[PDB]
Design a protein around this ligand. Sequence first.
Ligand SMILES: CS(=O)(=O)Nc1ccc2c(c1)S(=O)(=O)NC(C1=C(O)[C@@H]3CCC[C@@H]3N(Cc3ccc(F)cc3)C1=O)=N2
Length: 557
Amino acid sequence: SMSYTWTGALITPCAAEESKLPINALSNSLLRHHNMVYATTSRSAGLRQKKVTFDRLQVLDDHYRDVLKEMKAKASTVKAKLLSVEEACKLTPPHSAKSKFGYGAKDVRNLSSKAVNHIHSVWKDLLEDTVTPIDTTIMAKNEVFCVQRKPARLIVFPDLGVRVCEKMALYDVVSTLPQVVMGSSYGFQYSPGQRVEFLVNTWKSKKNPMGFSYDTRCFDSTVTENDIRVEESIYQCCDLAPEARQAIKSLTERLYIGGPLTNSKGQNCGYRRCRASGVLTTSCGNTLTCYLKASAACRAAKLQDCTMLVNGDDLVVICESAGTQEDAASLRVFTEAMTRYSAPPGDPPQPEYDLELITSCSSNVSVAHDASGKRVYYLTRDPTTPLARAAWETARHTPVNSWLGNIIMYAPTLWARMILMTHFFSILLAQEQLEKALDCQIYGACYSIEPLDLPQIIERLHGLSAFSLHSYSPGEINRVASCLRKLGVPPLRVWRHRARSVRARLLSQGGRAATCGKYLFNWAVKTKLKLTPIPAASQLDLSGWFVAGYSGGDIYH
Ligand SMILES: CS(=O)(=O)Nc1ccc2c(c1)S(=O)(=O)NC(C1=C(O)[C@@H]3CCC[C@@H]3N(Cc3ccc(F)cc3)C1=O)=N2
């Protein structure tokens, strides 16, 4: 069937949409080539509609059913709990989209009777009706890129009342089931340090390692009704309260499988028969379905000593080489199988023989050296999109601070340390906003973070070496430098100079600010301070951080 059917009604915005990079007195300190940076708007949604709309065929074989059997056996060991309304309400982001039914995210968060009443009525209707399609909204995402333009990605989500109900029925399932079913292959269980460790240990466990990323073309659109019913059958294996079983069946039939699409103006835009990108089960559903199809395709292709790492639709496979000819043929069979399962590639996958050439979760492994001269592996990326987004956030407040998410996940990198840390701490100092909690997204869930807790956060996720890395690889250095030239970003020498001021300013203020100056900017000075384990790091409550993925899942921690 068709991933989508369209009426002709346009996908519409709520507010005016800026596409040109907004400029203020701080923009030029970061980036000169403003016209390189753009944001997507609803006005390009028609272009995206074209791409995501296609027929899906699916041919399922013994490997497919075999792997599914294994997954269900593992799922059967999972006991999951129903969340109370209030419990589910407290998981709602403060900024989440308001209900069509007279209340908003803040009414949910502070448990207004109006919100709670409606949520109970929604839950009741779920138990009683397992057939009536549930309305969704389709919106266009506003996201920031550098020019090579990408059309806007789309988001499809049910009403707020429904979203709290999903949490009630499925928050525990989607948080706990994936690791049990997929074990070490489940990517969202790892911090950056743990993930790079897993990638490096896996690479080193092969006699002759070969690896590849598999880019499915528009994954969500490839997801069929079969896939969604299959994922429900996996959920149903869990030990669940009777109400949870019924609500899960109901949400599957009425929401997850498909439904009508409505724009922000309330006009019918068409019908969805594929994965909605804005439901609680988006990340878990995609991860299970990706792992099932890939695991079975590995068996079809007869990959040797094959290890998978899966983050939703993001997949990397590391195995034993049979030489370049056989590896290319193997990957073709793997791709043929994935295609039969309804997950054809975007870019065809290529076998890689150097771990550092493999991009997965938008990141590649690279090497640097710590204080002792010891080798340290870390995850990095082309800093173009991070810097384009940082530029936008220099002039505009956004509900999610990409810059902060990037500093947290890419702390050990040359570009996050030299540029992002220097620029944004300078801004926080000038506004006297060091103390102010900032929102960011980690594995799709929303967190309120205090920038002053960064040293502890970084110690916990990357280790102390994150504060002492040097002697970066020529390849990493060249990619960073070439990016700075492209965007018109001041050279790293300018950033070192600026950093020395930021550092001294932070040290002058004492307390947690001085700690930031000491740890985050030790790289900026010749005569370094001694960086010992931070006392406060040991008390940090980072439970919930690297448990599961929640992209589009409307989750706040
Ligand atoms: C839509 S889906 O099917 O869930 N696919 C998906 C793939 C990959 C996904 C996500 C979703 S996500 O929206 O949960 N966030 C992330 C993610 C993050 O949340 C953080 C935040 C900033 C980027 C960072 N990265 C890159 C990354 C990942 C691991 C790592 F150790 C270092 C860096 C990520 O991979 N990756």
